[PDB]
Amino acid sequence: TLVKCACEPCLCNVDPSKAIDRNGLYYCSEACADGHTGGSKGCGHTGCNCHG
């Protein structure tokens, strides 16, 4: 089963065995783990406009 990503507006479905999981919290890309600091969009894959 896939689990969500830790960004509420992130529509990505990742797994906690492959994702960049820090401490129980799954991040799809580095961008959701940094929290989209400063600049604009998303997680490096298509059309996800998630902020942090």
Going by the annotation, the residues of the binding site are 5, 7, 10, 12, 28, 32, 36, 43, 45, 48, 50
To Zn ion, the closest distance from the beta carbon of 5 in angstroms equals: 3
One residue of 20, 32, 41, 47 binding Zn ion per CB under 5 A: 32
**Segments in 9-52 forming alpha helices (H):** 30-34
The CB density around residue 24, as the number of other CB atoms within 10 Å, is 7
| 7 near Zn ion (CB under 5 A) | yes
Those residues whose C-beta lies under 8 Å from the C-beta of residue 20, and which sit 6 or more positions away, are 26, 27, 28, 29, 30, 33
Point out which residues bind Zn ion (CB under 5 A).
5, 7, 10, 12, 28, 32, 43, 48, 50
